Structures are given as C-alpha cells and as structure tokens.
Amino acid sequence: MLTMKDIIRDGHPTLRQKAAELELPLTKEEKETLIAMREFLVNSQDEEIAKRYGLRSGVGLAAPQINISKRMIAVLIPDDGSGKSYDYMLVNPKIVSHSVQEAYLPTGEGCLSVDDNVAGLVHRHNRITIKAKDIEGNDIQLRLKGYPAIVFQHEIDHLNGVMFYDHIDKNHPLQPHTDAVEV
C-alpha cells in the first residue's frame, strides 16, 4: 500500500527526467505498481483511510512521482454532478491532437510532490485526444475536455519532467489568457 512517504518531493531529480516508454506486455511488477497508484488515489479520496494514513487527496498520479521513471499514469476523478467519472490506468499515453483554445483552473494547480502552494494560472488545452495502452496492452483513445483534460495534461507533463509551476507567467501569474475557458 502506497502512502505520502512513497511520493518524492520537488527537487528530487527523477521529477525532472524524461520517463521511459514501456515495452508490452508489462511485467507483473509493472502491473502491481500501476494498480497501487490507482489504489493510492482511491485511498486518498476515502475520508477515513486518508485520515488514518495521512494521505493528501489526489485525482492523478504519474510513476515518476513514486520515483519510477516510466510512462504510466493513473487518473481517478469521481462523479461531480455531471454523471461523468474518469477511472484510467494508462501506459505510454500520448496527446495526438488538441484544441487551440486554452483552459485554466482559476485557483491555479496543486501537486502531491509539491509541499507548498504556488499561486498562478496554468493555461492548458481545453480539448485533447489521447492514445494510450491499458494495463493488458489493449488500445485506448480518450477524447477529453475541461477538468479531465487539465488533469491528464498535468500527469503527462510529469512524464516529460515538466512541473505545473513552469507554465505560470512570471509577471502576470493571475492574468487569464484571451478566450481561455475557466473550468
């Protein structure tokens, strides 16, 4: 069972490397680690378990964040009211197309690997298409918009050694871009 002590912190070099593509099929050990990543998000979102084990709530986790330099991510976004939820373990995910139009969380972003908050809007694509493999090496294409697009782009940044705060404007951190949609 993963906990916060498994999450490496900003400054750890693994967070700034470029994660490696996986060969398919995955090793038993690789499956186990991807299931535990999802299991972490599930645990962090249960108020009892998260309290008992001191978990920060998460909707996304990339393997580099537990110091494994490999291109797999977990996303767990619970139903918010839409009837739409997102429960995805992805191998070698890749953004293949996206909108020109940007979007931003008006609160800015947070990160399990970042102990402090950094203020500033992080502009991303409002709409993306992703090709990935699932845990069994089958093919997945995701068409995502808004909150889920932002989450997946955040997790994929991790695989290219990019950190949310790198996108924050230096002089005008809270300046929305022209026609950017607020989520």
Ligand SMILES: O=C(O)C[C@@H](Cc1ccccc1)[C@H](O)SCc1ccccc1
């Ligand atoms: O540390 C991570 O990579 C997981 C982040 C991802 C994220 C943060 C901000 C914006 C998009 C993605 C955590 O999931 S943030 C914590 C959280 C948990 C439940 C509800 C809202 C926020």
Ligand code: NI
């Ligand atoms: Ni993060």
